[PDB]
């Protein structure tokens, strides 16, 4: 609690799409090493021995992403062998959980300078490749009513009265704001183009974006068909017995995109920044971990946001920018409806519907997205949260410096 | 570490030993204390000695043949012991099935071929013994069945049935086809799915064919002889193991699909079978077998298995043994049956009587309608001939026994009368009175009525001693229960003669004394009325249907309320109101009657009109009526779902005890099987009467906890939940 | 230092051996739930809503151990859906890293009461089942000079002059002290026997222990036969060019045992324990993460121990007990030689050579071992450290309370 945790750098790779994507040929280890080299370029005289850990979120730590990919990034990039390296998995919030853990390690006074972020090469390591204790054990799956995230989003839209046109209207809004952010140059400094071992460009933009999306194009898509396997609808209605039928409104156009990407944030104390000649950009104000019902897994962002607002001593009116991951459109509309979030404050530079949701890295990507927009708008505070599988939730408040 | 139950410090011997000149040991199972071979304590010691001897003489043994001297190969386990297993006996139950399976595992890894000579029914532990063998030959004799039906008793195949069937067929096929529902298979279908390898025509060929297979297996497959596919170096489980990427992509959907087919009912046996199957497929065979043991003990010591073992084993035996049959009555064979009424019921009644081999004279008004009931019985044969079950020799003999007619004098020589004419007492009197003197004086005069008391109907004939109620359920050709109703004038001989008829057609009888609503129609009425009351109180209809499905019923109550006409339930209310008002008492209306009359007021009488609690389109039931929530202001009353469940289950359980107190029923076994087979009471309860002695909730387990929970419901929802004094002290 | 991190409970399962092990039939998820239920038994009135996170280390997070097994433990045990759940992997220190991160989250002030520990069912999920970002990439494996731990251990013995009799003498000491600790009842309260769904006993002791071990029997053992694959000796000697030949002194009797086990520690602030009526057993004085050469992969404890001693302003003389994981005998003798650790202070209750090394759970197992031994001796401080794959190191100093 003593030491304040500051963000000195927050960068990410472009997000390459799932089918015939530019980043499919890139190993996820290389996605992190490139970001490490970008930090070295922005700080040529950085004493890397002062870096005590590298914390990466990764939801499928298997194959290309197994064996502590954070430690592999430390060794492969030639970082000092004392610079740590640890992988963590908290499902969709792993990217933000790594930053929060890095901040909390700084606050404990026992760590000075830490790299935090995530990496998820979903084109190479699909979701569920790591198996799962809940999914593959029938006794746990039977007791804990397991249901995919897509069914929870449809249940939210059904209970809240979110029509297919309502969720598609938000999906159109995300494509527009993501296109406007790239056109205005908002992402020019934080999106680090991925290159090969020869320096040749591989990807410099978020190729999942469909900036010419129309209301007519979204209306012609078809609902999701772990889903498309029998049982999950009846299981959800067994707990939500007052709901008669689930309205399946979510498609590939109003849900987050399967993409590859990585993100890296440099967090340290004020003394670590002054000693290394690093200018602070934002201060980690407070973090929170909570959750809601594990069938409606995506209602977790609401109690996690109230929890972090309580700790920081703030209210909704004190936050200039709200950044919630766009796993599904109904989740964001539910979050906006509950906390009365103004529309011009919510996901102002587009979200995962347009740019993609690289599971282990999305939390650090949208965190650095708010570090840039707070600077560009000359605004003060931002709140970043993500829904989680299993019914969890994580929220973080940052303050521009 | 032992093939025996005790290894410190004198049962029967049930296995003979025959070793021929070629070193083939023939283990012939023959329990001297019964006609059925069973996995009792005597078998465990007998098989424990033989397996000890198989190992000690292995240098002189070339093959093993498992056979049986009884008509059946082997049938089930020791249910009288499993029902007494308390939770603190879990270690004893665990050690018992481990000893049984260590025997089979040694027989399976003997390094020699082992063949099962399946001469008859191989059920439960019987098939598990044959599954331990390397080759299964079965005689295609009639009456023989094979399967693992211990899920029907609340148990699981704990003698290797789960482990071995998963090794043979994979997780998905073994669960769906064999384990989850305990399906019984005729020898031809047992060979089709793979439970049986060879078929022979008679039992005489079995042992010689098994020995011939052993002699042939040793010559052609010497290194693989006596080695199961899963004990080989390159074994690959069908469909893959849980680590396989193809199975892991669909594996998380197995519990959710099972939760769909079970509709959320608290039946723990299928859950444990799926758990033991998947967890077993993750490890070696021996570890998988021990995991199977722990799940087996978890079911045996639970209350749900003690409910099902009481209902589907003990209660069913007591009924089939004649517990409600009058004492000391001889059998009176049936020469020619005569059915008065060719409608939906009389068609099936004439079919199930002809399928059993009885000459049936079917009468109706016109010969047109007299053959429309027979046309019902050709629709079932033309579908049983397409499914390749029966023969054209049997089917042409069946339909020949059904004689359609409109001549009342054609009832000459008819000694059994089953009437299915419409619910009109003057009509039943008319149809009977025009037939009593043409049929024999020795003839039974039965009525299929569901509401009209047998006492009043019997006064239309002279031999009221021969008048009785023979109440089938629709459809007749599938529903197993026959509710035999004893009128005031009904003789014990007539009751026993109909009891013999019910068993002769392959159905299960219960004896009921004459009363309003009898037993089935009366008890199920409290179930549908309890749900309509909840709808009027303001409970969401989707929650009410969810409560009925998660309680274990086959159909939710509002849906069932549409099948039974709402103006039919309203008539039963007016009929019962006149009965109480004529007696002088004041008729207190059930809170559901205001819901019935409100729905009838809106012209939504149910499925026949196409409008009820559900909407209907092209004969297919659509969703729930959207105007239903505005009518009854649903959503304003949100009690816990477990209260809705208990309100329906307790309503029927209390009404069952009232039936027992009033003498409507004679035994608890007739109440349990009557409620299970008759009205669809959830099988996990073991019947509406077992539900009292087996209730389990936060209050506890037993009759007292039932009384406490019933009063907890009574103070919250109405005095109808207050228990009768017979359940108190 | 405003918020201090206190250890209120520290429990573990018995360690079941690799072949014909008692815990092979037990899902690793079930190993954690049993410890969760034990904590409930010791505190029946605990408001589990105050528990904000469950942090489990796991080196092979795949299959039975995939899908965030910490969250799986939360849902399967019936803990509040707000209780978090995150899996992490820092190789052999994952268990101690989870305790450190829990302690650091408490000191940050943004977490109140956290369960921390680890689980590793090595007989069901062997080492390397998760793949590896290094071994899968030949270009990276070729660059970092990957050399397995057992060969780094044999290289330590050759450089430091440790004989086969020397490493076997320490192994005999471990078997004797583990047997004396078990016979003396030291482990009676913290080793929670594993039972099935029927309550039947599965395992109540550390079955990997060989209490009747003799020096003559250890000599008859043969050296270890991945290190059996060729090239690793030549690769190691290319880095350590002054050593002509590696003396392979390590066998299965002087190295850590492959076992199944789980450990769980309850960590919280003083106010959180007072609120729930919890009596503090020890205080986390400091944590540190450092590293050593990545080819030797095992000299990480020495800089990490010095780093945590400097962080707490302490020296070796201030420490009553030293607990270093017995991954290999030469690792411990090297650590003892460098810091001049007295023999009477080093692994006083035996170690992984006798009881086993469940990768993800070991760090939390040996930490609770020192919590009990400080109470039993009425001593003040204990230092706990584990060597890490990739040449990392983690050290923690606890103080009796
Ligand atoms: N429908 C059910 O689900 C159900 C359930 C239980 C009991 N029952 C009882 O079954 C009987 C009705 O049987 P069903 O549903 O097959 O009948 P149904 O509804 O098909 O009735 C029409 C039949 O009545 C016949 N009929 C009318 N007058 C006749 C006469 N004088 N002689 C002979 N036949 C005459 C018609 O010819 C035709 O055979 C009633 O007693 C009813 O209470 C019915």
Q: Which of C25, C124, C200 sits opposite B91 (nearest CB)?
A: C200
The residue among B492, B517, B542 that closes a domain is: B517
Q: What is the CA radius of gyration of chain C?
A: 20
Fold: same for A1-125+186-284 and A133-185+285-398: yes
> DSSP code of B95?
H
List the end-to-end C-alpha distance of chain C, in Å, as a whole number: 16
C196 contact residues in B (CB cutoff 8 A): 294
Relative to beta strand C113-121, strand C259-268 is: antiparallel
DSSP sequence for C125-183: S-TTTTB-TTTT-HHHHHHHT---HHHHHHHHHHHHT--HHHHHHHHHHHHHHHHHHHH
**A148 to chain B, minimum CA–CA distance in Å?**
10
Q: Which residues 184-223 of chain A have a CB within 8 Å of chain C?
A: none
Inter-chain CB proximity A66 and C144 less than 8 Å = no
CA separation for the pair C207, A188 (Å, rounded): 60
User: Is B301 in contact with C198 (CB distance < 8 Å)?
Assistant: yes
Last residue of a domain, one of B517, B544, B560: B517
B493's tokens: 């001989």
Contact C197 B295 (CB under 8 A): yes
Q: Which helix (H) or strand (E) element contains residue B351?
A: helix B344-355
Contact C343, C269 (CB under 8 A): no
Where chain B is discontinuous (C–N > 2.5 Å), the residues before each break are: 9
A108 touches chain B (CB under 8 A): no
Distances (CA, A) of B208 to A153, B184, B219: 65, 27, 17
d(CA B691, CA B703): 9
Q: Which residue of C has its CA nearest to B280?
A: C25
Domain-ending residue, one of B517, B546, B562: B517
Rounded CA gap, A104 and A287, in Å? 9
Peptide bond into B475 cis (omega under 30): yes
The residue written with tokens 């007696």 in the block is: B583
Q: Return d(Cα B715, Cα B710) in angstroms, integer.
A: 9
Instruction: Identify whether B471 is a catalytic site residue.
Output: yes
Distance of CA A144 to the CA centre of its chain: 25
Residues B152 and B298 in one domain: yes
In chain C, residues 21-40 whose CB comes closer than 8 Å to chain B: 24-25, 27
Residue B104's domain comprises: 1-333
Clarify whether residues B345 and B286 are in a common domain.
no
What phi, psi does C292 have (nearest 5°)? -135, -175
CATH superfamily, domain at C1-125+186-284: Thiolase/Chalcone synthase (3.40.47.10)
Which ligand 1 atom lies nearest to the CA of residue B521?
Answer: 6
**Helical ranges in B221-301 per DSSP H:** 245-250, 253-261, 268-280, 285-300
Cα(B544)–Cα(B619) distance, rounded to whole angstroms? 23
Q: Is A237 on the interface with B (CB under 8 A)?
A: yes
Same domain, B502 and B395: yes
A255: which DSSP letter?
B
For chain A, the C-alpha Rg in angstroms (whole number) is 20
CA dist B679 and B525 (Å) reads 10
Discontinuities in chain A with C to N beyond 2.5 Å fall right after: 225
Binary contact (A104, C110; C-beta < 8 A): yes
Closest ligand 1 atom to residue B345 Cα is: 16
Find chain A residues with C-beta within 8 A of B299's C-beta. Answer: none
B428 assigned ligand-binding residue:
yes
Distance CA C315, CA A5 (A): 29
For residue A287, what are the β-bridge partners?
Answer: A396
Instruction: Confirm or deny that B189 is annotated as ligand binding.
Output: yes
Q: Which residues line ligand 1 (CB under 6 A)?
A: B 340-346, 364-365, 369, 420-423, 427, 431, 448-450, 474
Phi–psi pair at A172, nearest 5 degrees: -60, -40
Pocket test of ligand 1: the residue of B338, B343, B473, B680 to mutate, having most ligand atoms within 8 Å of its CB, is B343
Rounded Cα distance between C124 and B289, Å, is: 16
From CA C264, how far away is CA C351, in angstroms rounded? Answer: 18
Nearest CA in chain C to B248: C63
The runs of H, that is alpha helices, within A161-300 are 164-184, 215-219, 232-239, 270-276
In the 8-state DSSP scheme, what is residue B283?
A: S
- Clarify whether residues B4 and B144 are in a common domain: yes
Classify A292 as helix, strand or coil.
Answer: coil
Contact between residue A314 and residue A291 where contact means Cβ atoms under 8 Å apart: no
Q: Which of C52, C91, C130 sits opposite A62 (nearest CB)?
A: C130
Q: How far apart are CA B528 and CA B610, in angstroms?
A: 19
Q: Are B294 and C198 a contacting pair at CB < 8 A?
A: yes
CA distances from A319 to A283, A314, A342, A379, A396 (A): 14, 8, 11, 9, 11
Task: Give, in order, the Cα–Cα distances in Å from B593 to each of B185, B538, B603, B607, C4.
Answer: 47, 15, 15, 18, 66
C-beta atoms of A231 and B264 within 8 A: no
Query: Which one is catalytic: C24, C43, C92, C241?
Result: C92
Is residue B455 domain-shared with residue B511, that is, in the same domain? yes
Pair (B383, B305) in one structural domain: no
Sequence ranges of the domains in chain C: 1-125+186-284, 133-185+285-398
Instruction: Identify which of A142, A146, A235 has the shortest CB distance to residue B271.
Output: A142
Structural domains of chain B, count: 3
Distance, CA of C79 to CA of C68 (rounded, Å)? 15
Sign, Cα dihedral of A285, A287, A293, A299: positive
Q: Is B80 annotated as a binding residue?
A: yes
Packing angle of the helix pair A94-107, A362-377 (nearest 10 deg)? 70
DSSP β-bridge partners for residue C121: C260
Is B298 within 8 Å of C197 when comparing Cβ atoms? yes
CA angle C130, C136, C141 (to 5 degrees): 120
Tokens of C43: 């505190």
Enter the resolution in angstroms.
2.4
Alpha-carbon distances, residue B565 vs B517, B555, B600, B708, C5 (angstroms) = 16, 15, 10, 35, 69
Please check whether residues B307 and B262 belong to one and the same domain: yes
> Rounded to the nearest 5°, which phi and psi values hold at B649?
-70, -45
User: Using an 8 Å Cβ cutoff, are B438 and B411 in contact?
Assistant: yes
Nearest CA distance, C25 vs chain B (angstrom): 6
B47 is in an annotated binding site: no
- What architecture does CATH give domain C133-185+285-398? 3-Layer(aba) Sandwich (3.40)
Q: Which of C133, C283, C285 to mutate to test the interface with A (most CBs of A within 10 A)?
A: C133
User: Do B510 and B543 belong together in one domain?
Assistant: no
Nearby residues of B424 by Cβ (< 8 Å), 6 or more positions away: none
- On whether the CB atoms of residues B566 and B695 are closer than 8 A, the answer is no
Instruction: Say yes or no: B414 and B535 in one domain.
Output: no
DSSP H/E element including B542:
helix B541-551
CB B519 within 8 A of CB B664: yes
Crossing angle of helices B253-261 and B268-280, rounded to 10°: 160
* DSSP string for A82-130: TS--EEEEBTBTHHHHHHHHHHHHHHTTS-SEEEEEEEEETTTS-TTTT
Q: What angle do CA A360, A361, A363 make, to 5 degrees?
A: 100
Asked whether residue B648 is marked as a ligand-binding residue, the answer is no
Q: Please enumerate in sequence order all residues whose Cβ is within 8 A of that of C225, keeping only pairs 6 or more positions apart, or say none.
A: none
CA within 13 Å, CB half, B1: 1
CA of B448 from ligand 1 middle (Å) equals 9
| CA R_g for chain B | 28
Question: DSSP for B206-229?
Answer: HHHHHHHHHHHHHHH-TTTTT--G
Method used experimentally: X-ray
Among B25, B192, B210, residue whose Cα is nearest residue B119 = B210
Question: Residue C24 is nearest to which of B91, B243, B287, comparing CB atoms?
Answer: B287
B79 burial class (0-12, 13-18, 19+ CB within 10 angstroms)?
Answer: buried
Q: How far is CA B724 from CA B586, B623, C41, in A?
A: 20, 39, 40
Torsion angle of alpha carbons A331, A333, A339, A343, nearest 10°?
A: 130
């Amino acid at each position: 609690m003593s030491e304040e945790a500051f963000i000195y750098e927050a960068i990410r790779t472009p997000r390459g799409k799932q089918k015939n994507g530019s980043l499919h040929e890139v190993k996820p280890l290389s996605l992190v090493v490139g970001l490490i080299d970008e930090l070295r370029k922005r700080h040529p005289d950085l004493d890397e021995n002062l870096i005590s850990d590298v914390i990466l979120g990764c939801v499928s730590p298997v194959g290309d992403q197994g064996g502590d990919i954070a430690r592999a990034a430390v060794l492969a990039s030639g970082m000092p062998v004392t610079s740590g390296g640890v992988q963590l998995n908290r499902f969709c919030a792993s990217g933000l959980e790594a930053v929060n853990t890095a901040a909390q390690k700084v606050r404990s006074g026992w760590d000075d300078l830490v790299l935090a972020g995530g990496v998820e090469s979903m084109s190479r390591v699909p979701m569920g490749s790591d198996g799962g204790a809940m999914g593959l054990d029938p006794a746990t799956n039977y007791d804990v009513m397991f249901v995919p995230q897509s069914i929870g989003a449809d249940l939210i839209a059904t209970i809240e009265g979110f029509s297919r046109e309502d969720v598609d209207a938000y999906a159109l809004r995300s494509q527009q704001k993501a296109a406007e952010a790239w056109s205005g140059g908002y992402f020019a400094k934080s999106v680090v183009p991925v290159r090969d071992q020869n320096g040749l460009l591989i990807l410099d933009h978020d190729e999942h974006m469909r900036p010419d999306t129309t209301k007519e194009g979204l209306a012609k898509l078809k609902p999701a068909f772990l889903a498309a396997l029998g049982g999950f609808d009846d299981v959800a209605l067994q707990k939500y017995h007052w709901v008669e039928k689930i309205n399946h409104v979510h498609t590939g156009g109003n849900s987050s995109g399967i993409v590859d990407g990585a993100a890296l944030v440099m967090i340290g104390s004020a003394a670590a920044g002054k000693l290394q000649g690093l200018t602070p950009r934002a201060r980690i104000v407070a973090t929170a971990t909570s959750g809601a019902d594990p069938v409606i897994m995506l209602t977790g962002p609401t109690p996690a946001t109230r929890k972090v607002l309580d700790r920081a001593g703030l209210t909704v009116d004190d936050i200039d920018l709200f950044e919630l991951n766009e796993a599904f459109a109904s989740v964001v509309l539910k979050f906006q409806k509950d906390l009365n979030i103004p529309d011009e404050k919510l996901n102002v530079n587009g979200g995962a519907i347009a740019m993609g949701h690289p599971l282990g890295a999305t939390g650090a990507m949208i965190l650095g997205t708010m570090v840039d927009e707070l600077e560009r708008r000359n605004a003060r505070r931002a709140l970043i949260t993500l829904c989680i599988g299993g019914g969890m939730g994580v929220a973080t408040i940052i303050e521009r410096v | 570490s032992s093939h025996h139950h005790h290894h410190h410090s004198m049962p029967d011997n049930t296995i003979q030993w025959d070793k021929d000149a070629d070193g083939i040991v023939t283990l012939t199972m023959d329990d001297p204390s019964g006609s059925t071979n069973v996995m009792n304590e005597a078998y465990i010691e007998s098989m424990g000695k033989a397996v000890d001897r198989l190992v000690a003489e292995k240098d002189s043994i070339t093959g093993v043949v498992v056979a049986s001297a009884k008509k059946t190969f082997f049938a089930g386990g020791d249910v009288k012991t499993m029902i007494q297993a308390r939770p603190e006996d879990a270690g004893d139950v665990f050690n018992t099935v481990e000893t049984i399976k260590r025997q089979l595992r040694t027989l399976e890894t003997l390094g020699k071929p082992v063949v099962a000579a399946i001469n008859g029914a191989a059920l439960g532990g019987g098939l598990e013994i044959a599954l331990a063998c390397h080759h299964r030959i079965a005689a295609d004799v009639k009456g023989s069945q094979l399967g693992l039906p211990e899920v029907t008793l609340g148990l699981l195949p704990g003698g290797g049935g789960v482990t071995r069937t998963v090794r043979m067929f994979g997780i998905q096929n073994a669960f769906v086809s064999v384990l989850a529902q305990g399906t019984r298979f005729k020898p031809a279908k047992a060979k089709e799915i793979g439970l049986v390898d060879e078929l022979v025509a008679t039992v005489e060929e079995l042992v010689p064919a098994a020995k011939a297979w052993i002699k042939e297996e040793l010559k052609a497959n010497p290194d693989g002889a006596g080695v199961q596919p899963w004990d080989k170096k390159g074994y690959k489980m069908p469909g893959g193991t849980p680590s396989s990427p193809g199975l892991a992509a669909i594996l998380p959907s197995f519990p959710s699909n099972l939760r769909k087919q079970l509709k959320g009912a608290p039946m723990p046996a299928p859950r444990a079978i799926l758990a033991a199957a998947v967890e077993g497929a993750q490890v070696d065979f021996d570890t998988a077998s021990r995991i199977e043991s722990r799940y087996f003990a978890s079911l045996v010591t639970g209350q749900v298995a003690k409910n099902m073992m009481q209902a589907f084993f003990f209660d069913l035996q007591a009924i089939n043994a004649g517990g409600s049959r009058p004492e000391g009555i001889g059998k009176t064979p049936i020469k020619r049956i005569g059915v008065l009424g060719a409608g939906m019921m009389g068609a099936g009644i004439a079919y199930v009587s002809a399928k059993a081999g009885y000459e049936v004279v079917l009468k109706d008004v016109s010969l047109e309608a007299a053959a429309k009931g027979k046309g019902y019985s050709e629709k079932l044969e033309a579908k049983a001939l397409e499914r390749g079950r029966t023969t054209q020799e049997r089917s042409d003999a069946l339909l020949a026994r059904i004689t359609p007619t409109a001549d009342a004098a054609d009832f000459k020589g008819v000694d059994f009368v089953i009437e299915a004419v419409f619910e009109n007492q003057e009509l039943k009197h008319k149809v009977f009175g025009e037939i009593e003197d043409i049929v024999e004086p020795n003839a039974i005069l039965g009525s299929n009525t569901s509401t009209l008391p047998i006492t009043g109907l019997a006064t239309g004939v002279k031999r009221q001693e021969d008048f009785i109620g023979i109440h089938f359920f629709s459809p007749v050709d599938k529903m197993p229960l026959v509710e035999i109703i004893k009128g005031e004038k009904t003789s014990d001989e007539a009751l026993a003669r109909v009891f013999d008829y019910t068993l002769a057609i392959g159905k299960t009888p219960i004896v009921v004394n004459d009363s309003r609503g009898f037993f089935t129609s009366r008890v199920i009425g409290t179930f549908v009325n309890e749900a309509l009351a909840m709808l009027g109180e303001g409970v969401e209809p989707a929650s009410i249907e969810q409560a009925g499905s998660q309680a274990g019923y086959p159909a939710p109550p509002l849906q069932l309320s549409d099948e039974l006409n709402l103006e039919l339930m309203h008539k039963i209310a007016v009929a019962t109101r006149k009965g109480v008002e004529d007696a002088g008492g004041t008729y207190q209306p059930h809170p559901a009657e205001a819901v019935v009359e409100k729905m009838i007021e809106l012209g939504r009488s149910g499925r026949l009109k196409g409008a009820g609690f559900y909407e209907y389109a092209d004969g297919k039931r659509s969703g729930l009526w959207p105007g239903l929530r505005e009518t009854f202001k649903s959503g304003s009353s949100q009690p816990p779902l477990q209260d809705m469940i208990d309100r329906m289950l307790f309503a029927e359980a209390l009404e069952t005890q009232k039936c027992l107190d009033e003498g409507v029923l004679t035994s608890t076994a007739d109440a349990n099987i009557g409620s299970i087979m008759g009205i669809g009471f959830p099988p996990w309860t073991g019947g509406s009467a077992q539900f009292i002695v087996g209730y389990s909730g936060p209050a506890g387990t037993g009759k007292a906890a039932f009384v406490a929970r019933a009063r907890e419901l009574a103070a919250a929802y109405g005095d109808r939940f207050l228990p009768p004094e017979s359940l108190l002290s």
